[PDB]
């Protein structure tokens, strides 16, 4: 009863080590399909999925260390990429080339995050802060503050007026981007939460924690509407459909499960990959996932609409 | 798909419904096909169908029933076999009275006592089309060893127009006569 | 309570003995639990079809269950543990045709039995049919047809 | 990471917290069971009789207004008549293998004929409530006998 | 629009009806399709128990119907609808509504108003008549008096009277058989009639059965009716019969959820053994409320029961169907929706105590107790007390936790432990003991005697006093069997003694004659730390390489074995380096200590390999430091491993990379430190040694400035300590004697005399020796080298 | 899907080929006359000869099509060969029965 699923491509070997962040972005209103991803190097190759294939089209550098979370957005051509190097530079994506350069460390920077219009890039910091940047426009307007610790995962509705916040030792913080005034901390999980992610329409916040399980929040209250408890070891990425039906989860397992929300189940288990899977993503039109693994290798899939 | 209707093709053999689904879906827009465990576009114009399945969604309503115009039994000469042709019959009956029905065959004698049964059954006029002389006629041959390094000679015992030739059967084992598993 | 007290990756060859369609013999290197579940299955077909031979109908309780065959039991255990394919192949002497087709013949069995399963009301056989079904298709066997996509 | 001995002495002597004695064990706690069967029943409200159908004039028919009716197919379910009047069903759903649902009729069948003229408004049939019960379920063979219970408004 | 509204697909017949709105304001029907499908929306959440999101669709659909009904108020079906949308809100815990009705509704037009139930309930009543009087159809008939029967419900409900909703009931009753007289061919009209008949206030069985059984006849396919029937003999103590209907119920529907419950409650009442597996499919269902807390009492029962651990009955359905998360969130539904009871608040407590969410567990706890106050005063209020102030004190805030042991009677064991734990952690250990020793006094279960004894000995030992903790640690020895905490407890406090004699003797104890501890760790580290007492430095190694060896599972035994050699007797780098990679491939939660040690493994090895990439020093150490990203030994260890490499890169001669990054690395190092508990020494080393390194990298990459101005910050906080001045004097320093050039002996003599303040560092002597050779002072060179020699030797 | 566009040349097929796929070749050869179908070990007949000989011309590509037989173990005996390339097809029955 369920859609036919199967792989469609299989890249041998995308960069020479682990393969840290994806990032699949039809940024254009023309066929552009790139695809953007960092490793465990400097290089932030920028692949292109043409026609039955992705061909490789910038091979673009500039850091010094491994880039920990990679970014594109969907309004302009640009791209953002943050290491362990204390720089935020974000690239041009057309002509291969750096745009600019942001000096920040591992206390004022951990992962990557557009604007739904893009123009901000929040990220968040060491000391419990979320750092809001922005581009083609400078530095550090302003920072929203919650009294915890590390956090690590930054998400945006898309449609404005949320930010979400996941942290070391489990807490949630969804701040509104209208106040910035602090509307409910959920408590969620004990272990780190390294994943969130709002869902189309934005009343549906899905978290994937440390110890496996993965809470489906409500947002504007805060009602939990169940857990989805199915694999056998963490969990790193949860990317959420187009249409709030689907959702696809990635454990370092070497396995990559794909939800349904309805009714709180497994459709189909991808069993692929050989080693830890860091980073998986939909495309447009949600009929294709990305999963970036530790082994390297970039798999695309086909999860017909 | 002109209409803005629904029609349902159903075809008996698993291996022999995904050819359908690639050229049906290469030769106009949208055709979903489902089987056992594959649901490919269960919103499509054109679903294919086993007959198992259709039989399984006539016994519940299904919510499609509603809209078909079609009903295009592929191979209808399967009647005949022992373990699934109670199938065809469950089918044939179940099917509400909106549904017309397209019956493709194999060329059998009795087609005037099967159209009349369905005509019957329901209560509307059938017409019985029936066709022979196949285009690119075929010539069937014998070909009996000899020589087997560069020569061979194949016997004509029936040509391409149905005469039976008893002298070429004849040439052929007079053929065998003179000469008198895996090696030959 | 036949099935219901048995290991999940241990009823999916339980039930490979309906399923296989291929010549049938017993086996010799089997572990007890399956050696007894075979026994059930086929008390169980004895007691159908001795109800259904005191009742009218002619088929004699051998004929009905004759068609009970294993002899994929031990494919089917090893399958659903974690053996790659070339030892399957080497495994027993049946063309790698035939197999796969049993084992995408039983995948569609063990996900039909979770919606009877939560329809009679056993929340337990749930738990293991969905656990059946998703460590059993993996690879080459339910490898994606060509001209489908 | 830290040297052993100073480490081993904050892994025992830091607190008595990690003792046996304070864990979630050791307590043997009780709860009281507490039943509440008649939260089971199960009280379905009516359809609402009316749609606003429109209205259209008999010549060039243009929309000119739009007036209540009152719709006839009513009290008729998914799983309970075989007719294309019925609701369509639960929701989107499974395509086949749905148990508890009606086919449509085969074709060769109508099977329609009452005419039931009554047809008035005011159709109160008198029925007595309290004279004589009926106390059997349609399958059992006894049902309950519960005791008699001893001991017309307006509004504007 | 409408066609899309029939066949589910809310969301675009709402889009839809909107895109019409826009365009023209007074479509009557446009109107009315939004206000039924935000109404089919609220129904929807409510099927769930997502109760906030149904009240405010039910509050937007009265926008529409009222604005509607502004334009032509003539038609009946907008009543009716209005009164549906505002009375589908029974059951929905009050104190949840405030709807804001505005304009005609309520009479007159003025402004906004907001309703509580009740009103909104009475609004319901007063719209249906309003549909009924110009329509006088069945339908409404029985709508109306099912609303009446939901207004008594409410108004009892809620306690506020009694036989003062008598004429309420009669109305119902009344309204009810109206519709069922006026038209006695539906089953719905007859099972509504009987429901109403036996309600409590009520009690007019024989009508409900009548009418039951007259809902039955009228049309064979009905789950309802047989549920219903077997709900009436069920109560009234018939289990049997009950039983039968309920079965009908089943055969005719199989996934109605009220049967299933039924079914579960008569499997309990005769005390079978699949009742818990049938209310976990009744909660696999559709989350109604009995079968809700019915599995979560079944749940924190079989927890209970300590003989369960090995019966496939704990092991398969509690650890692996995940019945805790499911107990967890059918109670949170459970509880949002009724919240006046409290064996409900305390399940939940329990079992968030056992996920570790202990923050929610306490609020739970502090619900409890506020339910609690007035009803009972017996000892249930005693226990949530203990359970709310020993929860809160596991998570600080510990003066709250002894306010909330304040409000109990001390007479019991769990209450007098509990406070003097809680005033241990914060402080005044003089009234901790006097606690345990009143504790001690009232003592059963020699274990927990043995206990209190070990808990006396280290709460009064942070006092200092440590001889009276040495015997008493014996006094707990001289019991009859030893309990495996005492000695522990015995080993360490003569660890944090010198002069390890007796932790021998204790650790010859806890081997001979104990073998159920099953951590096979802790005596590891035990006996390594014994070793290394007496100086010995490599036996430990061999130890833990003899342990081990016993048991080649258990990683956490590799990677102590790779963290040791890393600390003592760094010459087996190979073998650590070994080590730690086998401790991280066994598991993966180890990932974070193992890549560490296995970093600083490769650090000492220097480059003894094949030149291959992804597997230098650099490349694992920023795999643990994306492991875990909180600790402060990864980041030094990222510092080292860029001067190591641009080093090696340097010998090689292709280019030194990873040039500026050292200050934003001590930034982190130092922020990361600040949230640490307590390691004081160690914590003291790493900051120390960071800003050591950091200057040092600073001063050879060539940037000067920053590490004067970094030095000088960091002497202005604090008087000299004698390590930093030397880093100022090597960044002074540095400019000059690059370029040749000659130097005056005031400045030889400060520097000398500034190595000579801080001695028993070799770098420092060899750095100055250097600085000779340099000027050049050979012989005098020669015999600073021979003093560092001497010193290292040492 | 190799066989489609004739990047393969000779398809050592058997009945599946018959039945589950159309493909059209141009010369199809027989290796016998008699098949194993319920351990009688019977005689091919009619019906079926026709469906593999039918799918021996190509559209438009070709003149006619040539169905070889190739007899090889003894002679062809043109008795029952006479009523296997030519008979009436066969009949249309009703295999009708119940289940549960």
Not at chain 3, 127 to 133: F, L, Q, S, V
Not at chain 5, 209 to 219: G, N, T, V, Y
Not at chain 5, 553 to 559: I, N, Q, T
Request: proline residues 4%; hydrophobic residues 40%.
């Amino acid at each position: 009863m369920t859609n036919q699923y199967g792989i469609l491509f299989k890249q041998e070997q995308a960069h020479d080590d682990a393969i840290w962040s994806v990032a699949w972005g039809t940024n254009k209103k023309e066929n552009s399909e790139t695809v953007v991803t960092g490793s465990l190097d400097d290089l932030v190759k920028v692949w292109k999925w043409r026609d039955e294939r992705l061909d490789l089209q910038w091979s673009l550098e500039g850091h010094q260390l491994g880039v920990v979370s990679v970014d594109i957005s969907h309004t302009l051509p640009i791209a953002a990429s943050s290491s362990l190097d204390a720089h935020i530079r974000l690239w041009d994506l057309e002509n291969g080339k750096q745009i600019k350069s942001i000096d920040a460390g591992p206390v004022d920077a951990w992962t990557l995050a557009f604007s739904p219009d893009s123009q901000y890039l929040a990220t968040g910091t060491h000391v419990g802060k979320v750092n809001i940047f922005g581009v083609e426009s400078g530095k550090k307007e302003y920072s929203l503050d919650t009294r915890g610790k590390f956090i690590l995962s930054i998400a945006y509705s898309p449609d404005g007026k949320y930010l979400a916040s996941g942290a070391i030792d489990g807490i949630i913080n969804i701040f509104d981007i209208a106040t910035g005034k602090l509307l409910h901390t959920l408590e969620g999980h004990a272990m780190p939460i390294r994943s969130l992610t709002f869902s189309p329409d934005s009343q549906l916040l899905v978290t994937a924690s440390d110890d496996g399980y993965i809470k489906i929040y409500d947002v504007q209250h805060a009602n939990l509407a169940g857990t989805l408890s199915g694999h056998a070891s963490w969990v790193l990425n949860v990317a959420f459909c187009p249409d709030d039906t689907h959702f696809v989860s990635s454990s370092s397992d070497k396995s990559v499960k794909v939800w349904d929300v309805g009714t709180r189940t497994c459709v189909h288990t991808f069993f692929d990959h050989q080693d830890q899977v860091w980073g998986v993503k939909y495309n447009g039109n949600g009929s294709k996932i990305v999963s970036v693994g530790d082994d390297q290798e970039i798999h695309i899939y086909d999860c017909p609409i | 798909q002109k209409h803005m209707t629904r029609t349902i093709y159903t075809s008996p053999i698993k291996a022999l419904s995904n050819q359908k689904f690639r050229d049906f879906r290469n030769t106009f827009g949208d055709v979903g096909l489902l089987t056992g465990d594959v649901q490919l576009h269960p919103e499509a114009s054109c679903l294919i169908m086993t007959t198992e399945i259709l039989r399984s969604m006539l016994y519940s309503g299904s919510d499609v029933i509603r809209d078909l115009e079609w009903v295009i039994f592929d191979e209808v000469h399967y009647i005949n076999d022992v373990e699934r042709g109670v199938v065809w019959e469950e089918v044939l009956i179940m099917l509400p009275d909106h549904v017309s029905i397209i019956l493709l065959s194999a060329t059998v004698p009795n087609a005037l006592e099967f159209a009349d049964w369905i005509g019957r059954l329901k209560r509307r006029q059938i017409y019985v089309i029936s066709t022979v002389t196949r285009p690119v006629p075929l010539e069937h041959y014998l070909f009996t060893g000899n020589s087997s390094k560069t020569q061979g000679e194949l016997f004509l015992l029936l040509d391409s127009r149905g005469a039976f030739h008893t002298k070429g059967y004849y040439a052929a084992v007079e053929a065998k006569k003179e000469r008198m598993g895996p090696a030959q | 309570n036949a099935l219901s007290t048995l290991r999940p990756e241990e009823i999916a060859a339980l039930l490979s003995g309906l399923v296989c369609q291929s010549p049938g013999d017993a086996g010799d290197q089997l572990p007890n639990t399956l050696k007894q579940g075979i026994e059930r299955v086929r008390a169980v077909a004895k007691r159908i079809g001795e109800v259904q031979v005191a009742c009218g109908l002619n088929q004699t309780v051998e004929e009905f269950v004759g068609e009970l065959n294993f002899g994929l039991v031990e494919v089917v255990y090893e399958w659903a543990r974690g053996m790659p394919f070339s030892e399957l192949a080497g495994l027993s002497g049946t063309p790698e045709g035939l197999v796969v087709r049993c084992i995408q013949r039983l995948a569609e069995m063990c996900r039909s039995l979770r919606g009877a399963a939560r329809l009679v009301g056993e929340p337990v056989l749930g738990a293991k049919m969905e656990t059946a079904a998703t460590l059993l298709r993996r690879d080459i066997v339910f490898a994606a047809s060509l001209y489908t996509q | 990471a830290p040297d052993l001995q100073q480490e081993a002495e904050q892994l025992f002597l830091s607190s008595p917290a990690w003792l046996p004695l304070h864990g979630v064990e050791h307590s043997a706690r009780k709860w009281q069971r507490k039943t509440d069967p008649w939260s089971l029943l199960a009280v379905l409200g009516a359809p609402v009789p009316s749609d606003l159908q429109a209205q259209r004039h008999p010549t060039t028919g243009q929309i000119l207004g739009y007036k209540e009716v009152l719709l006839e197919n009513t009290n008729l379910s998914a799983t309970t008549s075989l007719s294309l009047r019925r609701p369509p069903g639960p929701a989107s759903q499974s395509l086949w293998g749905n148990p508890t649902q009606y086919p449509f009729w085969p074709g060769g069948m109508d099977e329609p004929t009452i005419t039931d003229l009554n047809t008035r408004e005011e159709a109160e049939e008198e029925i007595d409530f309290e004279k004589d019960l009926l106390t059997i379920p349609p399958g059992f063979k006894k049902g309950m006998d519960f005791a008699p219970k001893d001991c017309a408004p307006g509004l504007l | 629009a409408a066609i899309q509204q029939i066949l589910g697909k809310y969301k675009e017949a709402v889009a839809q009806y909107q895109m019409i709105i826009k365009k023209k304001e007074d479509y009557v029907p446009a109107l009315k399709g939004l206000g039924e499908c935000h109404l089919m929306m609220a129904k929807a959440a409510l099927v769930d128990y997502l109760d906030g999101k149904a009240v405010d669709y039910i509050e937007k659909a009265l926008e529409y119907f009222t604005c509607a009904l502004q334009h032509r108020a003539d038609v009946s079906c907008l009543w009716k609808l209005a009164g549906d949308a505002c009375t589908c809100l029974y059951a929905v815990a009050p104190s949840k509504v405030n709807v804001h009705v505005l304009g005609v509704l309520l009479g007159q037009k003025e402004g906004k108003q907001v309703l509580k139930k009740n009103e909104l309930l009475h609004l319901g009543g007063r719209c249906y008549g309003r549909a009924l009087k110009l329509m006088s159809t069945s339908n409404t008939w029985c709508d109306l008096g099912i609303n009446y029967y939901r207004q008594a419900q409410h108004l009892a409900e809620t306690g506020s009277n009694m036989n003062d909703l008598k004429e309420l009931l009669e109305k119902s009753l009344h309204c009810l058989k109206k519709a069922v007289r006026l038209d006695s061919n539906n089953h719905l009209y007859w099972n509504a009639l009987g429901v109403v008949a036996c309600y409590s206030g009520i009690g007019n069985y024989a009508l409900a059965q009548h009418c039951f059984i007259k809902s039955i006849q009228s049309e064979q396919i009905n789950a309802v009716a047989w549920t219903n029937l077997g709900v009436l003999y069920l109560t009234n103590e018939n289990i049997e019969q009950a039983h039968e209907a309920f079965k009908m119920a089943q055969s005719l529907d199989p996934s109605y959820l009220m049967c299933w419950i039924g079914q579960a409650l008569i499997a309990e009442a005769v005390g079978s053994y699949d009742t818990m597996d049938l209310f976990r499919h009744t909660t696999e269902l559709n989350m109604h409320t009995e079968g809700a807390l019915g599995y979560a009492y079944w749940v924190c029962t079989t927890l209970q029961d300590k003989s369960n651990r090995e019966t496939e009955l704990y092991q398969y359905n509690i650890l692996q169907m995940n019945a805790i998360p499911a107990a967890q969130v059918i109670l949170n539904k459970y509880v949002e929706r009724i919240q006046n009871y409290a064996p409900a608040f305390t399940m939940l407590g329990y079992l968030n105590e056992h996920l570790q969410l202990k923050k929610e567990a306490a609020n739970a706890y502090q619900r409890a107790i506020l339910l609690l106050q007035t009803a009972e005063d017996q000892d249930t209020y005693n226990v949530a007390i203990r359970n709310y102030g020993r929860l809160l004190c596991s998570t600080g805030e510990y003066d709250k936790a002894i306010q909330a042991f304040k409000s109990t009677p001390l007479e019991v064991l769990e209450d007098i432990i509990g406070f003097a734990l809680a005033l241990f952690m914060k402080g005044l250990y003089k009234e901790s003991s006097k606690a345990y020793e009143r504790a001690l006094s009232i003592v059963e279960s020699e274990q927990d005697k043995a206990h209190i004894l070990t808990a006396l000995a280290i709460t009064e030992y942070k006092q200092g006093k440590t001889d009276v903790a040495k015997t008493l640690l014996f006094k707990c020895s001289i019991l009859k069997e030893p309990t495996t905490e005492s000695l522990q407890a015995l080993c360490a406090l003569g660890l944090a003694m010198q002069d390890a004699t007796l932790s021998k003797a204790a650790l010859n104890e806890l081997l001979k004659h104990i073998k159920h501890k099953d951590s096979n760790y802790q005596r590891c580290l035990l006996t390594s730390a014994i070793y290394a007492l007496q100086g010995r430095s490599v036996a430990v190694q061999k130890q833990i390489s003899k342990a081990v060896h016993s048991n080649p599972g258990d990683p956490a035994l590799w990677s102590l074995l790779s963290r040791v050699v890393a600390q003592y007797a760094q010459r087996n780098a190979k073998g650590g380096v070994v080590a730690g990679n086998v401790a991280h491939i066994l598991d993966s939660n180890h990932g974070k200590k193992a890549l560490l040690y296995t970093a600083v493994n490769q650090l000492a090895m220097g480059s003894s390999s094949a030149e291959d990439e992804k597997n230098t020093a650099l490349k694992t150490i920023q795999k643990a430091a994306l492991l875990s990203p909180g600790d402060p030994a990864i980041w030094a260890g990222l510092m080292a491993a860029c001067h190591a490499d641009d080093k090696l890169a340097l010998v090689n001669n292709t280019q030194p990379k990873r040039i500026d990054l050292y200050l934003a690395l001590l930034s982190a190092v130092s922020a990361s430190i600040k949230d640490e508990k307590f390691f004081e020494n160690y914590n003291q080393s790493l900051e120390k040694w960071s800003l050591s390194q950091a200057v040092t990298g600073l001063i050879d990459t060539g940037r000067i400035s920053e590490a004067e101005t970094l030095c000088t910050k960091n002497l202005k906080s604090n008087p000299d300590q004698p390590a930093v001045i030397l880093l100022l004097r090597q960044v002074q320093c540095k400019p000059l004697l690059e370029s040749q050039k000659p130097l005056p002996d005031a400045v030889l003599e400060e520097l000398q005399k500034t190595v000579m303040s801080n001695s028993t560092s070799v770098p420092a002597w060899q750095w100055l020796a250097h600085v000779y050779q340099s000027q050049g002072m050979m012989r005098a060179a020669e015999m600073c080298y021979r003093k560092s020699l001497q010193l290292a030797s040492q | 899907m190799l066989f489609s566009r004739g990047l393969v040349k000779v398809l050592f097929a058997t009945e599946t080929f018959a039945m589950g796929v159309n493909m059209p070749a141009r010369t199809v050869v027989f290796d016998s006359m008699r098949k194993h179908d319920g351990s009688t070990f019977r005689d091919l007949l009619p019906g079926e000869y026709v469906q593999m000989a039918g799918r021996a011309g190509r559209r438009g590509l070709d003149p006619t099509g040539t169905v070889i037989l190739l007899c090889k173990g003894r002679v062809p005996e043109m008795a029952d060969l006479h009523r296997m390339m030519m008979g009436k097809p066969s009949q249309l029955q009703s295999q009708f029965r119940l289940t549960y």
